Structure 1
Amino acid sequence: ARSAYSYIRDAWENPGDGQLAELQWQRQQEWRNEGAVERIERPTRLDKARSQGYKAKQGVIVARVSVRKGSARKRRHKAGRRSKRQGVTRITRRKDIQRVAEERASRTFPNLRVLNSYSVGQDGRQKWHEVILIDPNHPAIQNDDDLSWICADDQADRVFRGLTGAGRRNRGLSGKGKGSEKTRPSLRSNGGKA
């Protein structure tokens, strides 16, 4: 039979329809009055969290992070530039809003490490995501055969180096064949061409 979890998932395929629609309308009102990084006791989308790695355990944290919608907030050139480089308005950043939210969260919790994240909606001017963080120093996690790997030294500050899930995708590492000649094994090694 369908899991109770499969129902949370289905509602979120259409966040604009049904009860979820009314729920979101209500919630966001309180969300807009909150901070940039708010630690929350329970994930808004249980199915997605658990699917990504979440566990109701000691040392597992979650935090909602809001980031502004739109393109780059760039300053216009102050010195000589050829027409090609005089743009301001249509320039966008190469990092995506979800990866930005992940970073602003990891900085708020300097001891924790990013596990993954998902989207929880957006209004006309901002987007909200919920990052899942893990305490690499808590022994409850150090003995978890599913999450212990995130304790190794080479996993330190993993988000800032693009080793996160949303990170690896934004780096164009999804495809294993055609179209991935300049992205794997890294952007930097391929002379920065993607």
Structure 2
Amino acid sequence: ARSAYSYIRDAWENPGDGQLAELQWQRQQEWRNEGAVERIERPTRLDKARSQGYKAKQGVIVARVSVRKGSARKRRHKAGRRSKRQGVTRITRRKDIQRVAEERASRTFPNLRVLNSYSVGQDGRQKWHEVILIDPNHPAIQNDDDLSWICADDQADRVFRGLTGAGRRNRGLSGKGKGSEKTRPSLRSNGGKA
């Protein structure tokens, strides 16, 4: 039979219809009055969080982060540039907003490590994502068969090096064949042409 979770999932396929639509209209009013990174005791999208590795356990944290919508907030050149390098308006950054969200969340909790994150909507001027963070120092996690892997030293500050699921996607690592000639094993090893 269908899991209760499937229902949360199905509601979020069309956040603009049904009860969910009404919920968002209500919630966002409060979110707009909240800070940049708000820790929350429970994921707004349980199914999604559990699917990404979330667990109701000690050392598991969830935080919502909001980021301004739009392209790059860039300053026009103050020195000589050929027409090609004078652009300012239509230039966009290479990291998607979800990634910027994961990094701000991780800065807020220096001791925690980003596990994954997912979207929870947006209005006209900002986007919200919830980020799952894990405490690599808590024994309840050090003893977890599904999460202890994130306790290894080489996982420290994983988000800042693009090791996140959103990080790997944004780096063009999804495809294993055609089109990934310059993304794998890293953007840098491939001269930064990916």
Paired residue secondary structure (2:90): coil
* 1:187 Cα deviation from its structure 2 partner: 0.3
Q: CA deviation at 1:4?
A: 0.3
Q: Name the residue aligned to 2:170.
A: 170
Q: Secondary structure at the match of 2:51?
A: helix
CA distance in 2, matches of 1:150, 1:169: 19
Per-residue deviation, 1:137? 0.2
**1:44 shift after superposition:** 0.1
Shift in Å, 1:90: 0.3
Q: What is the percent sequence identity of the aligned residues?
A: 100
The alpha carbon displacement at 1:128 in A equals 0.1
Per-residue CA deviations over 1:8-51 (Å, capped at 9, x if unaligned) read 00000000000000000000000000000000000000000000
**Superimposed CA distance per residue, residues 84-105 of structure 1 (whole angstroms, 9 cap, x where no aligned partner):** 0000000000000000000000
Question: What's the counterpart of residue 187 of structure 2?
Answer: 187
Deviation at 1:130, TM superposition (A): 0.1
- Unaligned 5+ residue runs, structure 1? none
CA–CA distance in structure 2, aligned partners of residues 175 and 16 of structure 1: 31
What is the aligned residue count?
194
User: Partner of 1:53 in structure 2?
Assistant: 53
Coordinate RMSD, CA, aligned: 0.3
Q: Per the alignment, in what secondary structure is the counterpart of residue 181 of structure 2?
A: coil
Following the alignment from structure 1 to structure 2, what is the Cα–Cα distance between the partners of residues 154 and 69? 32
The alpha-carbon deviation at position 63 of structure 1 amounts to 0.2
Measured against aligned partners, the alpha-carbon deviations of 1:62-113 in whole angstroms (never above 9, x if no partner) come to 0000000000000000010000000000000000000000000000000000
CA distance in 1, matches of 2:157, 2:54: 19
Q: Distance in 2 between matches of 1:105 and 1:122?
A: 17
Looking at structure 2, the residues matched to 192 and 178 of structure 1 have their Cα atoms a distance apart, in angstroms, of 18
**Is there any run of 5+ residues in structure 2 with no aligned partner, and where?**
none
| CA distance in structure 2 between the aligned counterparts of 1:165 and 1:79, rounded to whole angstroms | 38
Please give the alpha-carbon distance, in whole angstroms, between the structure 2 residues aligned to 1:20 and 1:66: 19
The CA distance in 1 between the partners of 2:113 and 2:80, in whole Å, is: 42
